[PDB]
Structure formats: structure tokens, C-alpha cells
Design a binder for this molecule. Structure first.
Ligand SMILES: Nc1ncnc2c1ncn2[C@@H]1O[C@H](COP(=O)(O)OP(=O)(O)O)[C@@H](O)[C@H]1O
Ligand SMILES: Nc1ncnc2c1ncn2[C@@H]1O[C@H](COP(=O)(O)OP(=O)(O)O)[C@@H](O)[C@H]1O
Ligand SMILES: [Fe+3]
Ligand SMILES: [Fe+3]
Ligand SMILES: [Fe+3]
Ligand SMILES: [Fe+3]
Ligand SMILES: [Mg+2]
Ligand SMILES: [Mg+2]
Lengths: 194, 194
């Protein structure tokens, strides 16, 4: 059960998250919970760790900028983080808020949430499951989500590669700064597209 | 004259380059020579340094992989360079071949050739002139070259930003590895697109 890892039941967690997140975001989290379970079944990842991490991945999505900056200082995180924003922070810094609120200390779950946006050059299968589940959950409808879904039915590594390539492409298309850890993921995984 | 910087005349250089490069590549170099001159006039860069750097920028385009690897060892360059290929090498390593062949020692010209492919987080105006001239020279016909040309008539920094964004976008589109120095350029310049 979820209380093996956190300080309340799944039902109680959902009630708390319903106060912190808008409806669309909570529905997304429920979508990622389900998608993570299915991917974990497929690729030999603990289904419970994957479901919980999937549900929690966007827990800190709505923390204010000031709250993140306070967390960066309190936990003495990389000071370069202050140069970025919510996209980077909600996972990479938000894990500390999740830890404070829910008493979450499992290192594997924490890491999977931490890098769910930007990935890393080295990812555990659990990391990969969350990173992919986020992109392919059933509420997502962006063009090419069908391709990502097909890829994820066959290869976890190729799905990471595909998602990361599309994200780099889209950020450059839009003219948004690209957090360097994303490129580390991109270069580590791009060979799987062949 | 060019012999203020190298060990032969422009005419003599062109004869030597005609043996090293296929016709299309030499025509490109002549195009960059002209484009660099015009941009340098516009943005307060020495027109002679810009023209010479423009002509020379792709001098080492046709060196073999083995030749580059030998240069990496002989000059004790970053050993990570061995992980890449001609795209990265012909500028970043090719400068040493240019130096050996032509007795080119001018630091500004050498730097502009060195980073003409990947850029850097900090670029001199001469660096920027070469990086842009390469992309907009009159023989180039890729879709959107017209946009790059318009931008380059108004702002050197915006032209660097635009070129770098399109390159990152296209590399990710194609599923090619992205040399990390390119992202350093991208993140440093992307704000000029606004
Ligand atoms: N390296 C990066 N730099 C900046 N933004 C990024 C980077 N990688 C992803 N993003 C963006 O961060 C936002 C949040 O992404 P993510 O956490 O994956 O999804 P969600 O929207 O469900 O939280 C997206 O708009 C995405 O494009
Ligand atoms: N960071 C990078 N990693 C890999 N290839 C790159 C990078 N930046 C540019 N390139 C590619 O290197 C090739 C050579 O580019 P460049 O030297 O700018 O033009 P030219 O073809 O005239 O020599 C191009 O195909 C370009 O897309
Ligand atoms: Fe997220
Ligand atoms: Fe999400
Ligand atoms: Fe080149
Ligand atoms: Fe060129
Ligand atoms: Mg993701
Ligand atoms: Mg260039």
C-alpha cells in the first residue's frame, strides 16, 4: 500500500492533492499513475513504486517561485537553479516539498520524480517509466502522442529517446532556454532512435 | 592584404584550396568571404580579418578522421573530442591544420574559424560575423534562409540566435547528437529572439 512509503493512505493523499492542484493537473497525475503501472508491468519495474511516483510526479507543480527559491537555499542546492523556473524546479526542487509533506524518503521514488522533466544521462528503469508515463498518459492529446504510445509498447529506451528528441526540437522551435541536463539525456539516448 | 596574416597571396591560397576542396565547397568559401565582408562593414568588424576568416573557415572540411585524431593527440586537445566527428572537428581541430599549412597565428581569426560551427557562450563580433556569414552566404538555399538574411541585415546577435535555434531544432528533428558547446551558444543567445 502507499502508506509503506508515505504518511497517509492513497485516498487521503488524493484529498490533499485535490486542494493543491487544479482539476486538470490532478487528472493528469491519475493518468500518469495508471500509465506508470502498465509500463512497469511491461518492463520489470515494481508496479507500486511506479504508481506512487507517477501519482506524485507533479505534486509541486503549483508552488510559487519564492517557495522554490527558499527550498534551493534551505537544502543548499545547486545555485545555478535560481537561473531557471518552474519547469526545472517542480521536479528537481519539488521533491523536497514532497518529502516534507508526505515523509517520503525512498531514494528510488524520489529520484524518479526529481528527473521526470529533464531526465539524466543515466536513468534507472523506474526513472524511465515515470519520464515516459508522463508523456503518454491517456489524457495527453498532442500531435504525435500516438507515435510515442506505439514506441512505449515496444521499448522503454526508445520511448525515452523519442520524447527527449521531441522536447529538444520543440523548445528550440519555440525559442525557450533548454536546461543543460536535458541535453545530457538527449545525447545519451538518441542512439536508440536508429 | 592576406599575406599580412598567412604565408601566401589570396590567388595562391585559392589555387591551394582548389586542390583540397571540391568545387561546391570552394564556391561556398568564396560566398562566405563575400558575406563576411558585408556583415563586417555593417557591424564594425575589420573587413579584412572577416574576409580571410570567411574564406578559410571550411579549409579543413575534407581532412580524414584519422588526420583529425592525430591532431587531437599532437596538440593534446580535449580527449572528449574523439567521441565526435567531422562536424565538430573541421573547425575546432581544423584550425591547427590551417596554422601548419598557412602559418596563420592571428588569435582572433583562429578563434572565429574554431567556433564557426558550434559557436560559444561568449563570441566576439568577428566570431559572430563568421558564424552568420556561413549560414547566409549567397549560394545557400535552404528553407528560411530568407528569414536569416533579413535578420542579419538588422542584428548580428539576433542572427546568431536564429541560426543556433534552427540548428538545435534541426539536429533534434533528424535525431543527431548535439555537441554541448552548441547548447551553451543557444542558451546565451536565445533571449535575442524576443
Ligand atoms: N530542458 C528543459 N528546459 C526547459 N523546459 C523544459 C525542459 N525540458 C522540458 N521542459 C518543459 O517543462 C514543462 C514541464 O514538463 P514536464 O514536467 O515533462 O510535464 P508536465 O507539464 O506534465 O509537468 C514542459 O512545457 C516542457 O517542454
Ligand atoms: N552541436 C552540433 N553537433 C553536431 N553537429 C552540428 C552541431 N552544430 C552544427 N552541426 C552540423 O555540422 C555541420 C557543419 O556545419 P557548419 O560548419 O556550420 O556548416 P558547413 O556545412 O558549411 O561546414 C552541419 O550539418 C550542422 O548541422
Ligand atoms: Fe512535470
Ligand atoms: Fe506531468
Ligand atoms: Fe563548417
Ligand atoms: Fe561553411
Ligand atoms: Mg516528462
Ligand atoms: Mg555556422
Amino acid at each position: 500500500s502507499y502508506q509503506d512509503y508515505i504518511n497517509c493512505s492513497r485516498e487521503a493523499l488524493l484529498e490533499k492533492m485535490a486542494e493543491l492542484l487544479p482539476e486538470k493537473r490532478l487528472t493528469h497525475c491519475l493518468g500518469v499513475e495508471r500509465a506508470a503501472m502498465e509500463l512497469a508491468q511491461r518492463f520489470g519495474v515494481d508496479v507500486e513504486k511506479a504508481s506512487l511516483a507517477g501519482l506524485l510526479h507533479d505534486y509541486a507543480k503549483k508552488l510559487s517561485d519564492q517557495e522554490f527559491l527558499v527550498l534551493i537555499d534551505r537544502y543548499q542546492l545547486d545555485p545555478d537553479l535560481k537561473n531557471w523556473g518552474n519547469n526545472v524546479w517542480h521536479g528537481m526542487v519539488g521533491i523536497y516539498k514532497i518529502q516534507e509533506d508526505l515523509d517520503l524518503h525512498d531514494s528510488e521514488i524520489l529520484r524518479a520524480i526529481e528527473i521526470h522533466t529533464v531526465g539524466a544521462g543515466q536513468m534507472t528503469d523506474l526513472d524511465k517509466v515515470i519520464y515516459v508515463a508522463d508523456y503518454i498518459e491517456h489524457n495527453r492529446a498532442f500531435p504525435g502522442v500516438d507515435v510515442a504510445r506505439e514506441i512505449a509498447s515496444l521499448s522503454l529506451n526508445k520511448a525515452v529517446a523519442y520524447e527527449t528528441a521531441r522536447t529538444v526540437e520543440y523548445l528550440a522551435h519555440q525559442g525557450f532556454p533548454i536546461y543543460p541536463q536535458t541535453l545530457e539525456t538527449y545525447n545519451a539516448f538518441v542512439h536508440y532512435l536508429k
